[PDB]
């Protein structure tokens, strides 16, 4: 009726969306290699004839928290965590290359090296890494080199077979896709395998969700949500009062 009902409704609806965005981070505190999503609000003015008094606010995801996660020491050979900044190249079920930070690796019955989510890990050849089937000792190098020991072979047979593809692009050019894999915003952009990133083998990288940061965002989203609801109530209260004009 006054268009301030919808101006406040559109703000209250967006505050719920930001609340859900923060809720996903808290639901994913223990997730491995999880980058917390950032939430903010953007002011978009309604340009047109009349006084510039109506400005909408909509929530967006400007970026992600690319800080180093909490490293968990597991003493497992097939667990690796990226030191500092970096990524691991994996292809999902669609055969589409995407960057990940989950270094919880495993070997299937055929020998292909996958991660906890089943994404095949790429290597030097840019093809999924395949290991000889009857292994005896698998050690992951600090730079990503994979050295294996054939079954029954003596100690002095630690030959390298593959090198884990570690990619360190600009963090501002990466977006989180629909399946948690970060990809270039510009499509058809090759992932250059960096040789500077290092793996801290024997440990797993946790999530970087700042629990306090989400909680203080929640309490501010609640108060701003409630204040706009009062604006909706006072908008209809004014409308009801301004109805006796035609009540002759």
């Amino acid at each position: 009726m006054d268009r301030a009902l919808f101006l406040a409704m559109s703000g209250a609806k967006q505050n719920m969306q930001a609340l859900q965005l923060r809720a996903n981070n808290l639901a994913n505190v223990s997730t491995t290699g999880f980058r917390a999503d950032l939430a903010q609000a953007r002011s978009m003015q309604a340009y047109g004839e009349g006084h510039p008094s109506r400005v909408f606010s909509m929530t967006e995801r400007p970026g992600h928290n690319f800080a180093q996660g909490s490293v968990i020491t597991t003493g497992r050979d097939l667990d690796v965590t990226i030191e500092g900044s970096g990524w691991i190249s994996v292809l999902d079920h669609t055969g589409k290359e995407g960057l990940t930070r989950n270094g919880n690796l495993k070997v299937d019955q055929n020998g292909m090296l996958t991660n906890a989510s089943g994404h095949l890990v790429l290597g030097e050849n840019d093809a999924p890494i395949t290991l000889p089937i009857p292994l005896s000792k698998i050690e992951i190098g600090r730079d990503g080199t994979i050295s294996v020991l054939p079954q029954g072979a003596p100690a002095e047979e630690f030959q390298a077979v593959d090198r884990i593809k570690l990619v360190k692009p600009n963090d501002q050019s990466l977006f989180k896709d629909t399946n948690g894999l970060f990809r270039h915003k510009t499509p058809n952009q090759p992932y250059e395998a960096d040789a500077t990133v290092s793996l801290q083998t024997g440990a797993i990288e946790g999530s970087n969700v700042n629990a306090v940061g989400e909680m203080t965002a929640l309490i501010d989203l609640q108060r701003q949500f409630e204040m706009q609801v009062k604006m909706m109530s006072t908008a209809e209260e004014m409308d009801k009062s301004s109805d006796s004009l035609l009540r002759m």
Binding site: M44, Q45, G48, E49
Partner: peptide
């Protein structure tokens, strides 16, 4: 105020540069 041209529609652009 009355005019002969119908009032223009508002824009509310997501990004002003995109226009």
């Amino acid at each position: 105020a009355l005019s002969n041209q119908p009032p223009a529609d508002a824009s509310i652009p997501q990004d002003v540069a995109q226009m």
